[PDB]
Ligand binder design. Structure first.
Ligand SMILES: CN(CCC(=O)O)c1ccc([N+](=O)[O-])c2nonc12
Length: 132
């Protein structure tokens, strides 16, 4: 199940992140900085509680959750959302809902790399992380 996702990951490729942020309404100055930032994502577990940290020189976030149990979240761009994370087809699928809108954050493992696919509206972004 989740164990192969655990650890420290560093961003090594990003496609269409500006399009995704624009779709969400993120302002230009935040997008400019975020486009050059290379976050570290740390995924830890304690029993069935997962913690996902995203660290950078700009934004820092942390969420803790049980798989399959909804939780409140405030995103890096300050959306207040209702979230759930689950394991679907071997992928870690994070769904965020607010104001009747949705976005998905899907994490898969491919050849040892962590591929994060972000979808909102028509915008589809792919970020690739490598394990530290
Ligand atoms: C979804 N992510 C996380 C990306 C990742 O973890 O690589 C985001 C990370 C950072 C910002 N931001 O506005 O600074 C975001 N705005 O929308 N999404 C944002």
């Amino acid at each position: 199940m989740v164990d192969a996702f655990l650890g420290t990951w560093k961003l090594v490729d990003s496609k269409n992140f500006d399009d995704y942020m624009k779709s969400l309404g993120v302002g230009f100055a935040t997008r400019q900085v975020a486009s050059m930032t290379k976050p570290t994502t740390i995924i830890e577990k304690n029993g069935d509680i997962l913690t996902l940290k995203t660290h950078s020189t700009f934004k820092n976030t942390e969420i803790s959750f049980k798989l399959g149990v909804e939780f409140d979240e405030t995103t890096a761009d300050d959306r207040k959302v209702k979230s759930i994370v689950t394991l679907d087809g071997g992928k870690l699928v994070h769904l965020q809902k607010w104001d009747g809108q949705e976005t998905t954050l899907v994490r898969e493992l491919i050849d040892g790399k962590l591929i994060l696919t972000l979808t909102h509206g028509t915008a589809v972004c792919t970020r690739t992380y490598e394990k530290e």
